[PDB]
Design a protein that fits this description.
It is built from 12 helices and 21 strands. It has 396 residues and is an alpha/beta fold. The protein has one domain: 3-Layer(aba) Sandwich (Rossmann fold), CATH 3.40.50.12780. The strands form 4 sheets. The chain has an 8-stranded mixed beta sheet, with helices on both faces. Strands 15, 16, 17, 19, 20 and 21 form a 6-stranded antiparallel beta sheet that branches. Strands 4-3-5-6 form a 4-stranded parallel beta sheet. A hairpin with a 2-residue loop joins β19 and β20. Its main location: membrane. Homodimer. It is a peripheral membrane protein.
Length: 396
């Protein structure tokens, strides 16, 4: 049985003195050994707040080491973290908290007004027994034990509930387990050219599935995570050069912008190797420009339902296969469901995925869960085409 929490501990056993989290803007540079110790302290605090195996703990906060150590500590307890977008209004949060039945909510100073609001009136989520702010978490951590929790859990046990649906009805909670997450981390770690002691920049919100699995596989491979809590495209390059960043994540929007800045002119970052792109496929031009700086780019297609895992278009095909979402990667297969209910590895129809990175179920959405699956394959809801050479092209 795999356990995301225990993996953090083994990483601290293998590379105790390796840098695990570096956040310049807040002067926080921690080691794996230390991050694990902080994770243990989070576990102790969580158990003290009545959190037990299966219970949900909501996280509404800025990217930080405490965010990470909180879900890691939750992982070691067999608890379930529910990371929330810090940009949505109080009524959407309340809904998520109520839907997930979160017992405890931990929030950062900048979202205190959303909590104080949900706290003040209406029909407040009745399951929440404790609302812990930044200073309070600080205090509790100070008197928390740092020993390893002893809880037999992992494998198929729930670990994360990530909400998504943007249309109407209501948001849907994607439940992920220790295994699906472990599997997603592994897929990225074995697919891309990522190596021990690499320094990877994480500019994306920790509540996004992509950022979560990045943190996880950073720990799996022994990568020093480089953070920028408040993304500032005017300072990115400096951070990248100062902390010797080898790998970075970004949306084609950002990248295109990042090469406008005067800094870009001729920056010297011999350590930076490539950007990992999500969302919309990179255009020829945008790729050629980065290629001129010996910086390559790889792009992928993934959903929250796929734990941020999926297809990947390797750098070498960046131009030859312009707008393609890539091909299968380690441990993840892709196919297309024909309008006749038949699943083919070539042709067109609805993109489907078969991989241990897939969610277990949508949180309390029986009907939704049944339709998403078709004999082991998950239905993405995206139409696409997989050509001869096996390259995927999304349509709508």
């Amino acid at each position: 049985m795999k356990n995301i929490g225990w993996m953090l501990r083994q990483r601290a056993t293998v590379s105790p003195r390796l840098q695990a989290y570096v956040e310049p803007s807040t002067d926080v540079r921690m080691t794996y050994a230390q991050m694990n110790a902080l994770a243990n302290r989070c576990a102790d605090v969580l158990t003290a707040l009545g959190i037990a195996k299966g219970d949900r703990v909501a996280l509404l906060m800025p990217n930080s080491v405490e965010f990470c150590c909180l879900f890691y500590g939750a992982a070691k307890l067999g608890a379930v973290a529910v990371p929330i977008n810090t940009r949505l209004a109080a009524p959407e949060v309340s809904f998520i908290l109520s839907d997930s039945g979160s017992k405890v909510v931990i929030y950062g100073a900048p979202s205190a007004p959303v909590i104080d609001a949900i706290r003040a009136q209406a029909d407040p989520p009745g399951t929440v027994t404790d609302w812990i702010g930044a200073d309070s978490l600080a205090e509790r951590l100070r008197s928390a034990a740092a020993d390893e929790p002893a809880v037999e859990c992992g494998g198929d046990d729930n670990l994360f509930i990530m909400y998504t649906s943007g249309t109407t009805g209501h948001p849907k909670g994607v439940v992920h387990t220790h295994e699906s997450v472990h599997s997603a981390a592994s897929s990225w770690a074995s697919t891309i050219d990522v190596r021990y002691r690499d320094r990877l920049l994480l500019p994306l919100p920790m509540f996004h599935v992509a950022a979560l699995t990045t943190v996880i596989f950073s720990a799996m491979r022994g990568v020093t995570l480089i953070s920028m809590p408040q993304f500032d495209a005017t300072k990115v390059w400096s951070l990248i050069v100062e902390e010797r960043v080898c790998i970075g994540g970004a949306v084609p929007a950002i990248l295109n912008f990042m090469r406008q800045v005067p800094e870009f002119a001729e920056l010297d970052a011999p350590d930076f190797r490539y950007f990992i792109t999500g969302g919309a496929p990179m255009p020829e031009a945008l790729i050629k420009i980065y290629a001129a700086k010996n910086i390559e780019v790889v792009q992928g297609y993934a959903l929250t339902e796929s734990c941020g895992g999926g297809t990947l278009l390797l750098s070498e095909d960046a131009l030859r296969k312009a707008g393609s979402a890539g091909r299968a990667t380690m441990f993840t297969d892709v196919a297309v469901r024909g309008d006749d209910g038949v699943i083919r590895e070539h042709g067109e129809g609805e993109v489907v995925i078969k991989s241990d990175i897939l969610l277990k179920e949508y949180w309390n959405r029986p009907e939704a869960t049944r339709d998403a699956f078709d004999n082991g394959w998950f239905r993405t809801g995206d139409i696409g085409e997989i050509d001869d050479e096996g390259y995927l092209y999304i349509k709508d």
